Each structure stands twice: as structure tokens, then as C-alpha cells.
Amino acid sequence: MAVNVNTNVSAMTAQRYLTSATNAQQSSMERLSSGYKINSAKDDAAGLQISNRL
Amino acid sequence: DDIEELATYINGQTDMIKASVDEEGKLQLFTDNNRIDGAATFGGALAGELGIGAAQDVTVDTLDVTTVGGAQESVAIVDAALKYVDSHRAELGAFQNRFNHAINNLDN
């Protein structure tokens, strides 16, 4: 195909899955410390409203 | 059978039709557009007992969920959308494989 040096598609794909792996891992390590799985509206917008009312 | 359990019965009997109850017993019959083109005709004593209803066209754009009735409708619409999207994904997939065997063939 292209045994080149300017583009590393395999490295880019590993880059993307590394980003998605530690984005969810960064989402964790804070539900454990806070003790809540709902601490920002981005986790569950519907859950935040009902949880606050409760 | 009460009104809600009847909806579950219809879903189990066939995958061609998705049924649900909105707020008072009204059935929200659904019809996937990509495979069940054309209007659906209702018959039988139960159909006369209930309302036949008109054929209303709904897509994801008009998909709204503010009451439980639209919520049961919405999952039906999304399921049809997902099937259409996945099927078209397979079309690209077969296009890719036809081309992978094309590349190594042309090299031969």
C-alpha cells in the first residue's frame, strides 16, 4: 500500500481508542470518590432533575 | 387480558408490527417504512371495538417525547431507523470487501 513515514494510520487508530479508553476512565475515578454516579448534567440530564427533586 | 398486556401479546406474535399503550388504552400501532410500505388494513371484531386510526407518517425529525405516549412511539421509530442505518452500513461493508478482492485481483 504505502510503507511510508509521514502518515501512521495504525498509530492514529490507537490514538482514538486511547482517548475513548481514558475518557471513560476519567469519568470513573470520580464516581467512586464522590460516591454518586450523577454529578454533572452530561451524565444523565433526566436523572439530575428527578434526583434533585428527590 | 387487559389493555396493556394485549400490546405485549401483539409484539410477541410478530415482529412486523410494534404496539403500545399511550395514556388511556389507545394503541399506537407502528409500521417500519423500509419494509412494510403501503397502508395497513385492520380487521376483526377487536379492530372494530378499538379505533382503526389513520396512517400518520412519522420520522426521527418529528420524533418528540413529552408524554409517555410519544415515548413508546419513539422507541419504535428509533428501532426502524437503526435497522435502516445498519442495513446501509452492510451495503458499504460489502462494497469494501468487493474492493479488497478487487485490489489483490488487479495486482495479479
Partner: protein, 54 residues
């Protein structure tokens, strides 16, 4: 019997108030305004179970 009637009509207000205060976050469980509410407990649509609180 007048004293007992005072206690009876006092507890009567409790029966009415408890039917008006049981809320669960802005709802009304025992008011009778809680109509037939269907709980979607199925993976797909339609597979729900209705519950009525008189």
C-alpha cells in the same frame, strides 16, 4: 363523647392530609389524581405493566 368526637375529627384531618401530602417529588400518590400509570419494564416497546393507586 364530645371529647372523643374532638379526637375523631382531629384524626379525620390526618387522613385527609396524608392523602394530600404523600408526594414522591411533586406527584400525588394517594390523592386519586394518580391515574393508571404504566411502567415500561421491557427491552422493547409495549411490554409495560400498568399500576393504579385508588
Amino acid at each position: 363523647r364530645v371529647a372523643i368526637q374532638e379526637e375523631i375529627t382531629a384524626l379525620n384531618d390526618e387522613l385527609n392530609r396524608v392523602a394530600e401530602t404523600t408526594s414522591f417529588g411533586g406527584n400525588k400518590l394517594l390523592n386519586g389524581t394518580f391515574a393508571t400509570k404504566s411502567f415500561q419494564i421491557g427491552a422493547d416497546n409495549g411490554e409495560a405493566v400498568m399500576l393504579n393507586i385508588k
